[PDB]
Amino acid sequence: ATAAPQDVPFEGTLKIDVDATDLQHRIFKVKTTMPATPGPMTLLYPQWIPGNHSPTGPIDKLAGLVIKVDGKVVPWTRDQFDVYAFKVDVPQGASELVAEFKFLSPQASSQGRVMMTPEMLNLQWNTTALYPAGYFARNIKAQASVTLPAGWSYATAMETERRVGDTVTFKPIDFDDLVDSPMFAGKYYKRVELSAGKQPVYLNVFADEAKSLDAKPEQIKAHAALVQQMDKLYGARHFDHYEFLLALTKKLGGIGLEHHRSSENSGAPNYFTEWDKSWTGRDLLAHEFNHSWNGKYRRGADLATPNFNVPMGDSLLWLYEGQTQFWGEVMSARSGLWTQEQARDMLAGVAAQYERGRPGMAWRTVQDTTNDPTMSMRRPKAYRNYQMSEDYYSGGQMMWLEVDSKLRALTNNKRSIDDFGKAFFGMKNGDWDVNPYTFDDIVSTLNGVAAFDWASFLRSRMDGHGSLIGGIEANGWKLVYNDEPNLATKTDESDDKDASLTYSLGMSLKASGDISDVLWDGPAFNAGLITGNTIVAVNGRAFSSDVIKDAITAAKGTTVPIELLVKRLDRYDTVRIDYHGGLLYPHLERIAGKPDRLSELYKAR
Amino acid sequence: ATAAPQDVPFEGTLKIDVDATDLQHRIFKVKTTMPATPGPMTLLYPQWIPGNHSPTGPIDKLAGLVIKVDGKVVPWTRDQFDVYAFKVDVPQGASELVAEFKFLSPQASSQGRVMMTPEMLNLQWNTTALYPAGYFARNIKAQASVTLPAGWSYATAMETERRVGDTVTFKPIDFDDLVDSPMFAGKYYKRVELSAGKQPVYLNVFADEAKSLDAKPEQIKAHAALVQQMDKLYGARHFDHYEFLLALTKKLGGIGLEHHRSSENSGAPNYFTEWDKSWTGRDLLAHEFNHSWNGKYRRGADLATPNFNVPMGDSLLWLYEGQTQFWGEVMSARSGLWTQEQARDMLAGVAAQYERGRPGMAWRTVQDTTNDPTMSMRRPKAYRNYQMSEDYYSGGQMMWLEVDSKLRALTNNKRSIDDFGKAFFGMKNGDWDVNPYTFDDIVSTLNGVAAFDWASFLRSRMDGHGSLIGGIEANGWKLVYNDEPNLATKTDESDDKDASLTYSLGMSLKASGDISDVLWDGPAFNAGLITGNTIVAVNGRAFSSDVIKDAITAAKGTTVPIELLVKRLDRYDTVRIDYHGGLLYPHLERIAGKPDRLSELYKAR
Ligand code: NA
Ligand code: NA
Ligand SMILES: [Zn+2]
Ligand SMILES: [Zn+2]
């Protein structure tokens, strides 16, 4: 029941002062100061957070709220039909409103992602802000300040005015850009320049331990090459400068959140020190960097809302996140963050996920999964393979691969998806405002690269139940399965000694034997198994990942079923699974007669 | 973005057929059938569920949705601004629409409360229903049927039409009453008569094991006495019959959900077999039963919404839940479910919670906590004592105790809160349609019992930051603290060897030493401790509940701080706590000069 935002001028400055020193309790103390308008005033806590596409504003972690007008406490009343809105009565003749409160950041992952550690912290200004209703967020001039733990370094795209002791005062900035300008801070910090020039790019690394900061020259070069490969694709940079924020940690909550001139990224402490073991997650920075073009600068019209407290429309997330998921993996290969073999096996895993690992495609479309952020909030679901889960990411990626293959086929390889990126995102270098688009704009730009009924193509994939993996075969490769482990799966289930058996027994297991996932309508599903049941023994032998894998191989081509001793709650039973296909892991193999367009796409420019 | 529901007739019957046989996967298979009106049609999945006061409808657990009109599949489109709304186009000349889908109930507590076990199940019809938009829910005639696991018994307030094998068909009923008529089913079942007559009351017990059903005659009498004591209070029953549903289980998710003619209740398997050990939870059935009057029959006007897909206004929950919490404990004493000593120590614990255990009262009011269902959804919060948490329950209980004492003082003990209950809820015996009320109705009825400015009294308590425990002293008792354990705390910490130290060290601990709660501004809080930290040792000795309690006693009156070895994540440190007050547990003591009105209130009528 809050009035709609108005594109009207905001008089004065919204001052946000944050004390970020209580690392033990994980509390941010906040004071927000703003001109006071006589009459009923409504203050808003940001609800829909850009980049999350859902109402992730942690309203229940705002505590200790006290509001004073010219030094006098005024009682506040929350709108019971808009719990993010706080109403007060401002007397006639008033000058200034001051709101003080605390943001109680998660004390465990069960409360949300952790944002403070003994060595670092992550400040997202939307969690420490109240702003007046009735204004477009871009119309509110803001000025932020933060008091850091003693001696800590910090990094943010937002420009600093001065640091006095441990209190950093920033230059004035529009309120929407303030929310889009998060801060990392910590005691173990290394700043590396990735690109010089007029629009420079920097890498800011914070770590649990200083040893994680020892990035080698070739490792830094791959990150510098990422910026170079991005320039080749778009031909423009949508920022006056860019600040990568990377936390190498086991304590901070994982994050991959994009912004115009920065991104919040988390990685394992061995991101650099064990480069060959930590590769599966190294597409993160390429992914978030691409969003500066696709998502931040160019955004769906129904997603580009006027403030943080009106609902966002996620209908075009299969471009926002879908093509960014596509380019994140592509750019990883082009920059050297991934090897070509690593990128190709990653692609095989995605292709298998939609050919055999998503039986829920029979009833649900990828378009409907753009509602998953608001529907699920990434909360646990029983069957990610049947309920589906934000498949506008990887399912959208597969479509954009087919778009690339179709663009090549229509033009005899003279045009590709690279031409769409430059045409759709490469305009107005230096602009980091919002440039909205609609579905028709995507179709029109695609048609400008190569004439075709792109409207039908896009809708048939996003609104259909059929195959999404056509881009693999069109670009000269074929998805196959054999007993050779997938490079991603091998790395992602080793050390833990887990067992991914999605395409054989239709389940995944931990080393303990606990089932961690069950494929809908697969062999494990048809034995009544669910996640949380335990495989106790295989053919009478105590469970291990190697034991169940060897039994799958021993059952290949025979008629002797696999005998599984299963614990369901407090009961034990034995099931016989008649699976005789052996171990099956996805790979890509060349089609000899066809041109290898896939390697062209993944090749450095 | 869904059109508002209108109080217009709905032509035909909404048929809801549920297959509840897949206990292994915990899946409810659903077929919903209704007349199909040509043109655009929107189907709604219930979102706001009565009794939860929040949008708890599990939309992301609806899977496999296929909609057919006269046997022909029609594509559905979800409203991206209303994810509970499914839109289809019904062709001209059509007759019938059928929607088939599956409700994937929780496979572990992390997905929600478990609703299916090998021995029992809980069917909530809102999870297995789709209904047409544009109609008041009470205008939709519905008919439900369910196929049970072979041979299982069932219980529900809904009248049965026929059971053919294991398929139970219920008589037609208004759709809003269908959602309000849940079913328990199981293999170990006992039906116990609590009250005969024209408006009979029955207790339906389902258990993990048949041995738990051996309720003794004196135990049944206490439940029968509960019905008699409620008759004395209200003088009317708002149902044609009432069916308690009680699950004695360690497998089904806990539940306490009220309805007009039934309630969903869970207890431990030793609810009857270890009567003396399971007492702390025995106010549940009294609590839920009272809601048939206070909450179901009488409801705040802003809470009595026209369908399940418009937001609810929780502003008057301090009567709905607050006075029900009050009567739940009082009726436990009056009926014999609790002894008078147990009820008195329970009340002492509530009084201490608001005298010393709720420092968040300094900034937040009890009225604002009526927004907690939608703000928090009972998700984990760091400081329930400072953020506060649904204090319209126990904080509301204390206000109603003060209301009772004021009614007695105004009338020389000739009137009490019993007269409000009869006046406000005792009209129209047999009626179980909703009779809404506003704040002014509460004031007017209180004024009719005894003239007073009740509007100011209620607002000052619920919009204030002052003491809520004034009814204790006004009714002749005083809240005190000593080292004698509270009966509730002792029972709720024994066997597990846990340690509740809220009023000494300001924290609670598990037997492992893991801190489970920290009181804002208390001694543990002032040492930087948070929930999830571990107390490893006390004065150098490995932690136990007895060890830390003995150290608290040993520190009483001295100046030697308590040395606690603490594990915080992967670091160990020793903290010195300068607490010298000893162990402190709350109790109620008589005021010798004042009349004992409290014992009158808790005495059986
Ligand atoms: Na801007
Ligand atoms: Na009714
Ligand atoms: Zn992304
Ligand atoms: Zn209740």
UniProtKB/TrEMBL annotation, chains A, B:
GO terms for cellular component: cytoplasm. Residues 505-570 form the PDZ domain. It holds the Pfam family TPR_3. It is found in: Cytoplasm. Gene3D superfamilies: 2.30.42.10, 2.60.40.3650, Neutral Protease Domain 2 (1.10.390.10). Keywords: Aminopeptidase, Cytoplasm, Hydrolase, Metal-binding, Protease, Signal, Zinc. One of its GO terms (molecular function) is aminopeptidase activity. Zn(2+) binds at residues 287-288, 291, 321. This is Glycyl aminopeptidase. It comes from Xanthomonas campestris pv. campestris (strain B100). The lineage of its organism: Bacteria, Pseudomonadati, Pseudomonadota, Gammaproteobacteria, Lysobacterales.
